Amino acid sequence: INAEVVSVSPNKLKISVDDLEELGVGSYLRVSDNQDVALLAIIDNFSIEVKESQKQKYMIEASPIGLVKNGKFYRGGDSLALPPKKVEPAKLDEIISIYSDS
Amino acid sequence: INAEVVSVSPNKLKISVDDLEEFKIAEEKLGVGSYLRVSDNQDVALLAIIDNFSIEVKESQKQKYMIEASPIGLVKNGKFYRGGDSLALPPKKVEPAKLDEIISIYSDSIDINDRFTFSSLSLNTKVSVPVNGNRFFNKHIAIVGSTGSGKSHTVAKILQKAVDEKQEGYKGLNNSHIIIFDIHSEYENAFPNSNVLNVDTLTLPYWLLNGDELEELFLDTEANDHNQRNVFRQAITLNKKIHFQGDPATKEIISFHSPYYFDINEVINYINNRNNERKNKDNEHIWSDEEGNFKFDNENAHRLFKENVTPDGSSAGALNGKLLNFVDRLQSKIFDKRLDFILGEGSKSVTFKETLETLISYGKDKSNITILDVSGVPFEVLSICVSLISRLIFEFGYHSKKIKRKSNENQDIPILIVYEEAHKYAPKSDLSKYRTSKEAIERIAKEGRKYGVTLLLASQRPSEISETIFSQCNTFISMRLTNPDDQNYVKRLLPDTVGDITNLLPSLKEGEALIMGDSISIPSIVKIEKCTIPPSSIDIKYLDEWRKEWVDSEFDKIIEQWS
Amino acid sequence: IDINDRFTFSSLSLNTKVSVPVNGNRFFNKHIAIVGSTGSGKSHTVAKILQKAVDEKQEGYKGLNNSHIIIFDIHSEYENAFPNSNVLNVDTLTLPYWLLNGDELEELFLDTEANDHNQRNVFRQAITLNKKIHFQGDPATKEIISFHSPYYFDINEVINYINNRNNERKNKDNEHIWSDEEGNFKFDNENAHRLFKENVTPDGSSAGALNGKLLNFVDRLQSKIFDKRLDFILGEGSKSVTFKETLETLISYGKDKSNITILDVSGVPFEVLSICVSLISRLIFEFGYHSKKIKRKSNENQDIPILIVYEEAHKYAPKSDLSKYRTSKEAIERIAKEGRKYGVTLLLASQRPSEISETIFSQCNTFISMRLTNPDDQNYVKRLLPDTVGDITNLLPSLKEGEALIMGDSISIPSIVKIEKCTIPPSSIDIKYLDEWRKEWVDSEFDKIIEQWS
Amino acid sequence: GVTLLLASQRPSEISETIFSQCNTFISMRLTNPDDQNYVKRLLPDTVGDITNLLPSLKEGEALIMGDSISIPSIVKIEKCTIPPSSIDIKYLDEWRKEWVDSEFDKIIEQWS
């Protein structure tokens, strides 16, 4: 598991990750290589879980802060906008469109 | 097969799926707030809204996504009944709710003539969400949202739809009557046919202010003695009797709080003439006038209002020089150019009928929406003029119900008073300076339901509104509210909510609402329709005016205006 | 439940065939608390219980039974529910002002924020003095009479006394000399009843120290006496009404006797609503309190059990300790904490139970709870419920319309019941705003309203 | 250059913000279950079955982890030639002695 959301609360997104090496409170969760559909989430807190049977995994509480479509940013959280998940080198300047487009 | 229930709580439903991507099937938007249809047999189904998504791993099989669902009600051949049913069982088939079943949530409970459609469901834009338009307006609306959420667009769209609501038997203005108190001059752009009244054109006569509003307009609560208050209401009440041209038995009815005509310039003379009073050896205030010589008695106190009064008496009076704090205070306010709309010469000359012809817009230029632009009104008198108009509209509606009760045929003039920035006038604090507009709005809220004068609270900070006024609203259209103190105020005050949609308040999209009340069939997350003519407030473009090269030609022109 | 003791107004939600009787004796004499949010049909189960209670009769006679229900509806809902009931709005109900005690007589007339303590001292000196002259018993009982005592006084004479005390002057002997048509005298406690006449001329070349301090007092009092909204409490009809005729009107024992008396308090001004609710609640409680005195002596009790229905019970008995609702809350609290044994019980009805005070909500024993979607109303009710069965009190936001959760001593066991469908529903005649707004611009109406105002 | 050293026998009472900043964690026998759950949750690094060895540690046998050490391990600290012994009032040694009576009068004079 690279990075995948495991719980979609109305105002929260719980994402379980194996390790921090595999940022901080208030950082923007941008791992996106999809055009015209993406999800933007800020980090509420970093939490560590107790499983007693597996390796410890970091759980991040993510508040959804917006949704971008072809470079246009709309505020408010939508749960629809993460069907894909793939590991490849992606761009970084799509966080510009959060503030620059409006 | 794909989706099945795995637990049936008293309040909740646990639904486990194996593939959410197949579960969408029709490519309907699926998320928190989406409707699930849980049934194995057609034409009878339980509709459940989604609280939260989850995952589970059996450690030896494929992972399964688990959905927390709140049963909102069961449908039965086009009839929707709220509340969870007994059909929710673990051997059941769950699927996204069909278009004919979601439409039946809202369309079945409201008659075809009673539907007031101004929005559509956020998760499903194909289904429109009507409200019971009779119950929507007659019980007060509370539109709540943070800045940048397009709350003013929601207020504008509801009033634009109410004005556009019409019967096909005529073409022209309908019977919609909306009064808007905008401090930001925002709704002028929204309604091009509206009647906008600012300080330049609004003429509010001062003599309909009651005792409470007359105190705060003229005197202060910190530096005036009780003697200065006493001489004020002596002059006001005595002035209201001579100008009363009606029945002399009704002359004794008149008190300080009565809304009858008085001349403030003649009141100025009384406090001036009592400022330079002189007493005699018998403590009798003899007065010398061009008309004649007289003492200060109740039966001849009306002739003291003339400015040609010379004081008489060998010694200075007891209250001689006592009113110089008072006369100079009120002489500043009558000739203050910022109070021309309320203390000017036009306030005396205008009549009672022309005031209500202006506030309700029943004069020459009849308009459905009357916009009271209170941006130019000074903030020290803002809560007084808001209280004056809110009292003038209520007692219009209170006296509206007395005419046609006798006649037995009621034409009726329903009035909706929109309070933009509603916590400015009706606050949580019980300060005396906001006291007049608080009980005037509270009279609309607690009593105006039955007299045809209701209110719309459009505020950016709902936590500052008083609970005795905010709870009297029944339908609540909450936009994106992210402040924890405004959420905790609203979440405590909302009368009816389905599971976990209330938590969606900080994460709402722009134009996306959260509407409840007696009007709507169920609390749903709706997307308000986009305004063709948006309520864009005209404001100074500071960055544009910064890069203006410093022409400084206008300053020499400004001082001539000041002089 | 014994067969003659059953009061069936509902059947089980999960099984329509089984009826759910309650011990109707124990259901009513211990106070009810019907609670349910908007759209849950809370007004229908209040309507159905009272419709079942009115029609609950014996087979030995045909006519009215001994049901005595008083409804406080600000929303004007129950007029259509009971067509045979007595409805009293402002225009018909005539509540005398002199039946108010000391606490209600201040907030009707005065404000604590602006009135100085010496100003208020003139008010209850005038009323207490006025309450003795108009009292027509022996002079020994006149010493008992105080400000808080409920006897007849004339508010116009109190108005004159307060206005005359604004004209108090002293002579060289420092006495408040008053010149009257009957005679010339100083202000004395023996001859202070002649100060009630308006034909009193002030005397003394030097005015009093407290002279002119009561204009903020009398002008506040001037407006309320001739206020057209307060005509029902401060009009000429409140002077002419008798003590018996007020109690005849409140429980419908006049010429038109009805089981249910409906107090349409919609037209009551919101500043005096907590005073008229407190006045009627105290009048009915003291009616039941003084009902038990004779019947003990008679040795066979005929009884008038009274159930006062407080629709929107959070407005009259709120959780907030504010002095505006202090009079109505204490009058409801006296009925809750004492009216069980005097035959004056209460039915609290509210869409927001969390605003009712817990000292009054807990005094109810049987709670009928409809849909409670508001989370603070759920947490309040689940805390105050005296009974439960496992995980049925978590069913509150998922209850249907007309489906209730009823517990207490009346019922055998807490259960989710389905209240019977109200054949005559409590419809409220409210202005259909859209149905008027789709009509064309009416312009002949606005001219007529202006002539009403003048 | 001002660095600290949080030495405490009740680690769970220390606030998390202060405690987590320290990154080298030398731990002796920790046997309070609330103390163990606090430390093992606040660990920067872990090896599967060596954090559970904390209540079974010997006398002077320590668990030291952090970026300074190469790998987490269960170590034995060298025995102190001069141990940090605190001089205290030996209650049972004094209570076994005879009733001291002259010393009560001397205390009150100092107090007065």
Residue numbers in the entry:
A (entry chain F): 7 to 28, 36 to 115
B (entry chain A): 7 to 569
C (entry chain B): 116 to 569
D (entry chain E): 458 to 569
Lines quoted from the article behind this entry:
We first determined the cryo-EM structure of HerA alone at an overall resolution of 3.14 Å. The single HerA molecule adopts an elongated structure. It can be divided into three domains from top to bottom: an N-terminal β-barrel domain, also named HAS, which is a characteristic β-barrel fold seen at the bovine F1-ATP synthase and HerA,23,24 the central RecA-like catalytic core (RecA-like), and a flanking four-helix bundle (Helix bundle). Unexpectedly, HerA assembles into a split spiral hexamer with a cleft between the topmost and bottommost subunits. This is in remarkable contrast to previously determined structures of HerA homologs, which form a planar symmetric hexamer. The C-terminal hook docks into the surface grooves of the neighboring subunit to strengthen the HerA oligomerization; however, this interaction is disrupted between the topmost and bottommost subunits, destabilizing the hexamer formation. Interestingly, HerA alone shows extremely low ATPase activity. Structural comparison immediately explains why the ATPase activity of HerA alone is inhibited. While the pocket created by Walk A and Walk B motifs can accommodate the ATP molecule, relocation of the R finger is needed to hydrolyze ATP because it is too far away (20 Å) from the Walker A motif with which they form the ATPase active site. However, the required conformational change would cause a steric clash at the insertion and four-helix bundle domains, hindering the required movement of the R finger.
Here, we biochemically and structurally characterize a two-component defense system DUF4297–HerA, demonstrating that DUF4297–HerA confers resistance against phage infection by cooperatively cleaving dsDNA and hydrolyzing ATP. DUF4297 encodes a protein containing an N-terminal DUF4297 domain (a putative PD-(D/E)xK-family nuclease) with predicted yet-to-be biochemically characterized nuclease activity and a C-terminal domain (CTD) with unknown function. HerA, widely distributed in archaea and bacteria, encodes a DNA motor protein, which can hydrolyze ATP and translocate along DNA. The enzymatic activities and anti-phage defense function of the DUF4297–HerA system are activated through supramolecular assembly.
